[PDB]
Amino acid sequence: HAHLKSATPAADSTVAAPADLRLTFSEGVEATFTKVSLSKDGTEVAIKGLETPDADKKTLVVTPAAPLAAGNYKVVWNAVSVNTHKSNGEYSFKV
């Protein structure tokens, strides 16, 4: 199953407006079947895009509609691997 190895913004780290989130998994994931929910103090923030650029499909680029306002962000992810297995979790970060 796909484990999330690293994010960026990194779990619980603080940053300036990153432009997008990168999620790096232990296996290839499917952009089309994978769900990512980004929320700021408990209301949806709008994701415009999901993509796996490289061909291993191990980094998921999650592009929000706007650049991100400063504050407290919760990511909830439901990955579907290239072999169709479902995993999930969550993490936080701050701008």
Q: What amino acid is encoded at 22 in this protein?
A: R
What residues from 53 to 92 belong to the interface with Cl ion (CB under 5 A)? 89
- Tell me the residue length of the chain: 95
Q: How many residues bind Cu ion (CB under 5 A)?
A: 2
Q: What amino acid is encoded at 95 in this protein?
A: V
Q: Locate tokens 């952009």: which residue?
A: 31
Residue 3 site contact among Cu ion, Cl ion, none (CB < 5 to 8 Å, cut-off depends on kind): Cl ion
Rounded alpha-carbon distances, angstroms, from residue 90 to 20, 45, 53, 56, 73: 17, 15, 22, 23, 11
Residue 4 site contact among Cl ion, Cu ion, none (CB < 5 to 8 Å, cut-off depends on kind): Cl ion
Structure tokens at 72: 């407290």
CB of 16 to Cl ion, least distance (A): 26
Residue 1 site contact among Cl ion, Cu ion, none (CB < 5 to 8 Å, cut-off depends on kind): Cu ion
Contacting positions for Cu ion (CB under 5 A) = 1, 85
Contacting positions for Cl ion (CB under 5 A) = 3-4, 89
